[PDB]
Amino acid sequence: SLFNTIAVL
Amino acid sequence: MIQRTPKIQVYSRHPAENGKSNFLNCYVSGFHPSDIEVDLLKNGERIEKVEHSDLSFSKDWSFYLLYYTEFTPTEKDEYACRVNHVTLSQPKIVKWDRDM
Amino acid sequence: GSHSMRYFFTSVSRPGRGEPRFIAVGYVDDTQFVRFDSDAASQRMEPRAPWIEQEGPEYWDGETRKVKAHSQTHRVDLGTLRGYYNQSEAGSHTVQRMYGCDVGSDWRFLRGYHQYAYDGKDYIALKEDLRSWTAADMAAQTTKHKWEAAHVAEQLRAYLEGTCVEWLRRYLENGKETLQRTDAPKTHMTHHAVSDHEATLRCWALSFYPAEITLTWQRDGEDQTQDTELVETRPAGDGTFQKWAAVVVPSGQEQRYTCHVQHEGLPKPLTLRWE
């Protein structure tokens, strides 16, 4: 199950 | 940038037994970048029904892939892995050896 | 007993060839269970283990949605990073991403990871506390300044501590036959004659799970580290792994050498000798 709201670099 | 040369292994999934079906594996690892051409050969000719694993990588960021095909070993049929990569001036052919 | 779950993302930019490549793969210990390939016709998170096929439509819809989301973030990073080291719009470049968590025999939380690399050189990673960052060079000091403000770590932290361990724990008890197994290596030894005076002894370990193993040769009890040919552990293709170690020995002296084998599924580490 993946992580949800992923931050941009 | 970084360029790492693939390590190559040619092997069967099971101990090779003439007339019994198996899988021929070629595992390439430790390479960067990920562009690579890997062929399995039968008596020096490209086998057409060859699959590979989904691209993944190690702790040190270098890439590894498993290429594979179904086969029935015989006494006289020669098998090999042919690999080309930007770190290689010509493709590298590695022969299959059942005790290796 | 200890376990772990990891996710790997790779992006090779395709300039003058269209959309960048994107491969997403997922693992429990050394068994892969899911993948997403950009050039595959599905455009959906696919099952790669037979114990994950048990999940319903809401799970696949969920993992599909989130995976497309990871993909698009990577699509942006490639240019952001291209806009730091002075890279041309011409050449190709790679971004790599690992994140996941580890547990013990009790299945309770052990540690979490989030690493990031650009072009095979390390770039930025969560420190072992999950509250701070290691920046590999001057360029990722700007990434660090940026993420530190927007509490990016705290989101990554809560997943890695809670939601990560809970899903790992459902998977282990769904793949009980597969994941909660340890297969002892089937070990044996071959003898090949190089010449009339030298001979090769290869020590074999086959059909084991998971991949972790130590093979060593000794002569009279003294380690032969300098003189051992050792191969990288390799997939068999059926969920198990293979490995070997070899020494070149004089004929008659074969009884002086012993092969030593340590695995998670051997109660006593084995010592092998040639007859």
Smallest Cβ–Cβ distance between B99 and the set C35, C122, C202 belongs to C202
From 3.40.120.10, 2.60.40.10, 3.40.50.300, 1.10.3720.10, which CATH number describes the C182-270 domain? 2.60.40.10
Residue of chain C with shortest Cα separation from A9: C77
Question: Domain residue spans in chain C?
Answer: 1-181, 182-270
Chain A residues with beta carbon closer than 8 angstroms to that of C164: 1
Q: From C181, C240, C188, C253, select the one nearest C215 (Cα to Cα).
A: C188
Instruction: For residue B99, give the chain C residue with the closest CA.
Output: C190
Taking contacts as CB-CB distances below 8 angstroms, the residues of chain C near A7 are: 73, 147, 150, 152, 155-156
The token duo for C34 is 């899911």
Strand partners, B25: B11, B68
Q: Is B22 helix (H, G, I), strand (E, B) or coil?
A: strand
Residue B70 Cα, gap to closest chain C Cα (Å): 11
Domain boundaries, chain B: 1-100
- Tell me how close the Cα of C143 comes to any Cα of chain A, in angstroms: 6
Q: Which of C63, C76, C156 sits opposite A2 (nearest CB)?
A: C63
Against chain C, the chains showing at least 3 CB pairs within 8 Å are A, B
Nearest to C12 among B34, B99, B100 (CB): B34
Residue in B with minimal Cα distance to C115: B59
Counting as contact any 3 or more CB pairs under 8 A, the partners of A are: C
Contact C116 A5 (CB under 8 A): no
CA angle C138, C144, C149 (to 5 degrees): 145
Question: How would CATH label the architecture of B1-100?
Answer: Sandwich (2.60)
CA distance C158 to C156: 6
Give the 3-state DSSP-derived string for chain C, with helices as H, strands as E and coil as C. CCEEEEEEEEEECCCCCCCCCCEEEEEECCEEEEEEECCCCCCCCEECCCCCCCCCHHHHHHHHHHHHHHHHHHHHHHHHHHCCCCCCCCCCCEEEEEEEEEECCCCCEEEEEEEEEECCEECEEECCCCCCEEECCCHHHHHHHHHHHCCHHHHHHHHHHHHHHHHHHHHHHHCCCCCCCCECCEEEEEEECCCCCEEEEEEEEEEEECCCEEEEEEECCEECHHHCEECCCEECCCCCEEEEEEEEEECCCHHHEEEEEEECCCCCCEEEECC
Q: In the Cβ-directed half-sphere of C198, how many Cα atoms lie within 13 Å? A: 7
C-alpha–C-alpha distance, residues B11 and C69, integer Å: 39
Q: Which of A2, A4, A8 sits opposite C7 (nearest CB)?
A: A2
User: C193 and C274 in contact (C-beta within 8 Å)?
Assistant: no
Task: Please judge whether A3 and C156 are an interchain contact, meaning their C-beta atoms are less than 8 angstroms apart.
Answer: yes
**Cα gap C236→C208, rounded to integer Å:** 9
> Is C23 close to B55, i.e. CB distance below 8 A?
yes
Q: Quick one: closest CA in A to C118, which residue?
A: A9
C69–A9 CB contact, under 8 Å: no
CATH number of C1-181: 3.30.500.10
Size of interface A-C (CB pairs under 8 A): 41
CA dihedral C40, C100, C172, B69 (to 10 degrees): 40
Do C94 and C12 touch, CB atoms closer than 8 A?
A: yes
User: How many angstroms away from the CA of C108 is the closest CA of chain B?
Assistant: 24
Flag if B61 and C120 touch (Cβ within 8 Å). yes
